[PDB]
Amino acid sequence: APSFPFSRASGPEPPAEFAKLRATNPVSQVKLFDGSLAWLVTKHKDVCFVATSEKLSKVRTRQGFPELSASGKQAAKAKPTFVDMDPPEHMHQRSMVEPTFTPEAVKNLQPYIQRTVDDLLEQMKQKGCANGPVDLVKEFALPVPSYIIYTLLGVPFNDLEYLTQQNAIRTNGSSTAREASAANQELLDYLAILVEQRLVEPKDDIISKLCTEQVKPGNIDKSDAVQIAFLLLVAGNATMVNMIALGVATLAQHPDQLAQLKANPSLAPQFVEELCRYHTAVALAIKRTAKEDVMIGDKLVRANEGIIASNQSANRDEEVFENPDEFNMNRKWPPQDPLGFGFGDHRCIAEHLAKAELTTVFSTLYQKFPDLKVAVPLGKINYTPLNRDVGIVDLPVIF
């Protein structure tokens, strides 16, 4: 059994192991860091089964749960938030914060998302690049999702820049363990203050709704409110930043597709759809433990055995997506859902918001900067370390 997780084949590529497994061993066992074994599911149909089976659990206190790192094992000791819950607890807590993320709410949020993107791009234009390239990540990819989530949560305008930087330090590969920890705890302390504040004087934000509708009535306590707001912040921010950066790099890699997008920004939604399939930046989130024996393919997963369902491999499943390793914004989509945002009950709560942020970015970026170009050879792009989910650390650009 090979050690899992695998390392990407290269900066912008998924691990090479998946294609071979899909072809000759779709459901197999892998060895985790602690020496325990777990079942790796690689086919789309099977990943969907794992994501919806009621015989499988997300509860991390169940022996056999596939923790992939020492830190993951430690984090499993804390009181869980809906991300690690099974029904009925899952939706009982998730429904507390779903309103802001519904397709309807996101549609009504479009003007705000557009304004945020516009202002950040305008800031870039004003600053210019007369003295050399600027980092697209620091100046745009990072602040866009950060400002939006922080604002929706309840953070005041004047605190956005500092908090965006601290949250970045949390996941920056350059941060030492102490630095990452300090930034993490610091964000929690800040959220605790916002909760105390909103409890006394609620405003029009997520934290206020949690305080008024859940804390005051006694449905949850203050610390719970903090953890839920914290989950909403850290769950998808780093991913968003990486998706925006990967999107820009991808368009640079395929000139004609960038030409097409520039000539028709209405293709942004299709482009984002392909981007979320092709670059599955969150590939290790669909994990379960079997509550009882369950058959998957030609394998029997016994009770208490862990399962890791690769949505990344599923999105490259040739049986569902023809020419899966080809990035094509004009792709003819099958009836089967690409799994960039997961599947089933736990499917990304912010899928619609995430898609809206990305479509707003890619329907605007090249209208504002039609001559935007990565200021370094594409093969020299600084990607996240290969043993991590795909992403880009910094991306110098000129325009």
Binding-site positions for heme? 348
CB of 41 to ligand HEM, least distance (A): 13
* Binding-site annotation, residues: 348
Between 22 and 279, CB nearer to ligand HEM: 279
What CA–CA distance (Å, rounded) separates 261 from 270? Answer: 10
Would you state the torsion angle of the CA atoms of residues 81, 82, 84, 90, taken in this order, to the nearest 10 degrees? 140
Q: How far is the CB of 137 from ligand HEM (least distance, A)?
A: 15
Least CB distance to ligand HEM at residue 53 (A): 12
Q: Residue 288: what residue type?
A: R
Between 237 and 257, name the residue whose CB sits nearer to ligand HEM.
237
Tokens 């991306």 correspond to 395
Shortest distance, position 389 Cβ to ligand HEM, whole Å: 10
Q: Which helix (H) or strand (E) holds 258?
A: helix 255-263
Q: How far is the CB of 316 from ligand HEM (least distance, A)?
A: 15
Residue 107 tokens, joined: 């549609």
| 228 SS3 class | helix
| Smallest gap from residue 148 Cβ to ligand HEM (A) | 8
First to last CA, the chain: 49
Q: Which is nearer to ligand HEM, 60 or 346 (CB)?
A: 346
Q: Which is nearer to ligand HEM, 32 or 276 (CB)?
A: 276
* Binding residues vs ligand HEM (CB under 6 A): 51, 82-83, 94, 145, 149, 231-232, 235-236, 239-240, 243, 276, 281-282, 285-286, 311, 340-344, 346-350, 353-354
C-beta closer to ligand HEM: residue 321 or 399: 321
Which residues, including other chains, have CB under 8 Å from residue 224's CB and lie 6 or more apart?
A: 79, 81, 214, 215
Residues 6+ apart with CB under 8 A from 275: 243, 246, 247, 250, 327, 358
Residue 109 or 350: which CB sits closer to ligand HEM?
Answer: 350
Under the phi-then-psi rule, with left for phi > 0, alpha for psi from -120 to 50, and beta for the rest, what region is 316?
Answer: alpha
